[PDB]
Design a binder for this molecule. Sequence first.
Ligand code: HEM
Ligand code: HEM
Lengths: 141, 146
Amino acid sequence: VLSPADKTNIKSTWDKIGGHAGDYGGEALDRTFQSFPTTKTYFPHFDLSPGSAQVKAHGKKVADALTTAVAHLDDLPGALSALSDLHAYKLRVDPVNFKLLSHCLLVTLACHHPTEFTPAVHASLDKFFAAVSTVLTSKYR
Amino acid sequence: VHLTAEEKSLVSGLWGKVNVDEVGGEALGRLLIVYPWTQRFFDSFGDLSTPDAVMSNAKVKAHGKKVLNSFSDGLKNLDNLKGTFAKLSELHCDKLHVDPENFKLLGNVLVCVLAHHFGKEFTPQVQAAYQKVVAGVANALAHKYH
Ligand code: HEM
Ligand code: HEM
């Protein structure tokens, strides 16, 4: 769905994360590789060691993307349609993967920002992650 | 569950610092809130209809506690999880009929509440070990369906 409480909680958090998005994206990748190794599968051209510049660089990209979305919450499908094609048509990605990164991305936010990690916000983002993921998986469905 | 020595030192290292009255409460609360369907197993618990309602409800604090104590029990016995949870496993499966996918999800929200609580000390290192233990528990509990 995505009601206007939601959308508020989401904006406000992303405002507060501001200039750090780019590192949070770095880290959430980290955590993902490290807690769910099956995912490194998709990055064989990556230096998948811990502070590596390969990881860091994407991270910035994965977080720009989410920034972009945060701006088009009404038109998530327009907003991310090229990435939709990327992950579905070209990278051929297991949908289970998104559940996993979504969880590490949530985590990284809870680490950095405990105070605005109230349960009400937690729910809202979750929900945001689930929506973004549905979108990148939509070409399967 | 493997859990190499390093991993063990890191798990039990953090778990020393965890306020067990608190965290059961928050983990469980959070479940009801982010996955609303889970509420159907707690009708007995009274008003859960709003987030502050759940945050504030006593029966929930009081379980949270019981759930997190049992997770304590599984930390001692990391070896034979299977044994430690089997009796509990028969309850979630038979008398309760909880689909196991929901074990996961408690497990993950617990990883959440930790992270929120421990800030940086929750390194990718640390969270990997708990992912492990968490996944262990959820299987150990699923057992009576295997
Ligand atoms: C919210 C979820 C995700 C978002 C926002 C996202 C965003 C992006 C972006 C921005 C790119 C870079 C486009 C480019 O190639 O210049 C990318 C590429 C890619 N994505 Fe993701 N992605 C997400 C989820 C996933 C998941 C779950 C995986 C795999 C587990 C994944 C794997 C990849 C891979 C392998 C590439 C190309 C890697 C490279 O060569 O640089 N994405 N994605
Ligand atoms: C990590 C997963 C879990 C652990 C460690 C766990 C642990 C426990 C424990 C220790 C009790 C019994 C308390 C007693 O001694 O009286 C219990 C009961 C119960 N669990 Fe959980 N549980 C898990 C997952 C779940 C989930 C996901 C649900 C439902 C979605 C669930 C629903 C219940 C219910 C309804 C009871 C008993 C309710 C009552 O006494 O009124 N459990 N669980």
